[PDB]
Design a protein around this ligand. Structure first.
Ligand SMILES: CC(=O)SCCNC(=O)CCNC(=O)[C@H](O)C(C)(C)COP(=O)(O)OP(=O)(O)OC[C@H]1O[C@@H](n2cnc3c(N)ncnc32)[C@H](O)[C@@H]1OP(=O)(O)O
Ligand SMILES: [Cl-]
Ligand SMILES: [Zn+2]
Length: 258
């Protein structure tokens, strides 16, 4: 009745949430998505026809990052409306809430793919409001379930902060963070603040992380104290811990200006 499973590429993925695909698309569905253009179809037959016809082998937009077989395509929703609407319907399957799927023009989408001989296979993405009333540098972030727990989510988070640094600005993800968002951000923020430390204003300037996110991270690392209510960094090179990363953003492979 609702879409509960999709076939994309040669993965099938069960839904985590309702996504408002048109009702008849509630086939089973089984919804069958082209992995390159993200067109949604109702039947294996229209799926197989499309696959032999569709000429796309990668996302639209500009490839603003490439290192080994990892790339990021920047995709303005005003210029690739249908693709971006298709993407937002896909993402809503794994996001407990999203803005209206058809209203993509206020956003730019950064699409992460793994590249092989066949083409560039979508791993995940984040979106960003062109203008955020709350200073959000990410609106939604997603690694598709089959690629999760491999470092792709932290890669995207890092990449969003690379864009913030280049724009000489601090940013934070849009609230509320899902429980998995919470774990990923806390993890990335701790690694970055720890690798840096080995001022809170200065940590902010250096990383584009907000002072509020720096403070809450430092508290959870026990590296902050109170002096007449004011938050003071309190640490030793002693630890600055690092016991129990996999893919990082190389600024040299990034081709983007503010
Ligand atoms: C602003 C917002 O968009 S909030 C919404 C965020 N997105 C979602 O909720 C969509 C569904 N979830 C996801 O797409 C992802 O889980 C993200 C994008 C939230 C995480 O993506 P991943 O590719 O799994 O991230 P990655 O492998 O980089 O791991 C990040 C951290 O989260 C932890 N984590 C990820 N999944 C789990 C899990 N199932 N159980 C426990 N910890 C987990 C990882 O172990 C890692 O912590 P570590 O650094 O201590 O190892
Ligand atoms: Cl699944
Ligand atoms: Zn296609």
């Amino acid at each position: 009745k609702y879409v509960d499973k999709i076939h994309i590429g040669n993965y099938e993925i069960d839904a985590w949430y309702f996504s408002p695909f048109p009702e008849d698309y509630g086939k089973q569905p089984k919804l069958w998505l082209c992995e390159y253009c993200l067109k949604y179809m109702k039947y294996e037959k229209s799926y197989r026809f499309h696959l032999g016809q569709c000429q796309w082998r990668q996302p639209p937009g500009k490839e603003i990052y490439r290192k080994s077989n990892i790339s990021v395509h920047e995709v303005d929703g005003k210029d690739h409306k249908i693709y971006c609407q298709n993407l937002c319907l896909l993402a809503k399957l794994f996001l407990d809430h999203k803005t209206l799927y058809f209203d993509v023009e206020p956003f730019v989408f950064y699409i992460l793919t793994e590249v092989d001989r066949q083409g560039a296979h979508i791993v995940g993405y984040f979106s960003k409001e062109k203008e955020s009333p709350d200073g959000n540098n990410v609106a939604c972030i997603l690694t598709l379930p089959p690629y999760q727990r491999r470092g792709y989510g932290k890669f995207l988070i890092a990449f969003s902060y690379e864009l913030s640094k280049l724009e000489s600005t601090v940013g934070s993800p849009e609230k509320p963070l899902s429980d998995l968002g919470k774990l990923s951000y806390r993890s990335y923020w701790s690694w970055v603040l720890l690798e840096n430390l080995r001022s809170i204003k200065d940590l902010s300037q250096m990383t584009s992380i907000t002072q509020n996110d720096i403070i809450s991270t430092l508290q959870s690392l026990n590296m902050v104290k109170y002096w007449k209510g004011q938050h003071v960094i309190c640490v030793t090179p002693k630890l600055v811990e690092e016991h129990l990363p996999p893919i990082t953003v190389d600024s040299v492979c990034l081709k983007w200006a503010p």
